């Protein structure tokens, strides 16, 4: 670990600086360093970790999609042969993306999840596990594709089961988990009806619980509820 010599508090401080500077690769490296100190993460610290890697991998995914589209076009009839370069470069970006996902999943397995006893932390990390298997699934084309998909599904399902037992239907982690699991169903599992059902049920159960909330909690919950509605509008 290149961050092994840096104080945990310094790593967290620098992660926050890197966020302000929009230096998400640095932010992720700082947070990896912080995780590798071996202490549990606070809520704020979990969010730094998630924001960092979300941005890094989000960029990789966007690039991979550009490249995959170019590659697909190259394999249509009437497309003049351009050699191996498009495939090679798509592979390069893919391998880097897979590496980032493996890094994140590694942190979750060693040892964030096993030490996470509170619902809020355990659901947060299992959602992440689902998310990073989902990203691996987006680029999977071979023997292990089904097992990657099932790994995502299993993580999301464990998260759902805990969140339903332990958190109110308006909890932002519970909402965000459902949002993403719904997308998993639509985009990965070829289960659009399950995706729609999930988004709808999640929205309605949240709606019914808004009355219990402060103005600030209301703002947080309704924001994600709008994302559910946005997806529903896209899909129906």
């Amino acid at each position: 670990g290149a961050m092994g010599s840096m104080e945990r508090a310094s790593l967290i401080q620098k992660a926050k600086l890197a966020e302000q500077a929009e230096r998400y690769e640095d932010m992720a490296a700082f947070m990896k360093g912080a995780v590798e100190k071996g202490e549990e993460l606070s809520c704020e610290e979990r969010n730094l970790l998630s924001v960092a890697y979300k941005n890094v991998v989000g960029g990789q995914r966007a690039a991979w999609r550009v490249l995959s589209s170019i590659e697909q076009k190259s394999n249509e009839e009437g497309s003049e042969e351009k050699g191996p370069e498009v495939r090679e470069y798509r592979e390069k970006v893919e391998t880097e993306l897979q590496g980032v996902c493996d890094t994140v999943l590694g942190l979750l397995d060693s040892h964030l999840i096993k030490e996470a006893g509170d619902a809020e932390s355990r659901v947060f990390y299992l959602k992440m596990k689902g998310d990073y298997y989902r990203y691996l699934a987006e680029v999977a084309t071979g023997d292990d594709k089904k097992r990657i998909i099932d790994s995502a599904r299993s993580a999301y399902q464990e998260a759902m089961d805990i969140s339903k037992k332990e958190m109110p239907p308006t909890n932002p982690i519970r909402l965000g988990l459902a949002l993403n699991f719904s997308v998993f169903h639509y985009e990965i599992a070829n289960s659009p009806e399950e995706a729609i059902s999930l988004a709808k049920t999640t929205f309605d159960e949240a709606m019914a619980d808004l009355h219990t909330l402060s103005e600030d909690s209301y703002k947080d919950s309704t924001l994600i509820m709008q994302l559910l509605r946005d997806n529903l509008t896209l899909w129906t």
């Binding site: 998310d131 949002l179 993403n180 639509y186 994302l227 899909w235």
Partner: peptide, 5 residues
Amino acid sequence: FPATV
């Protein structure tokens, strides 16, 4: 592309 968080 659909919304995720």
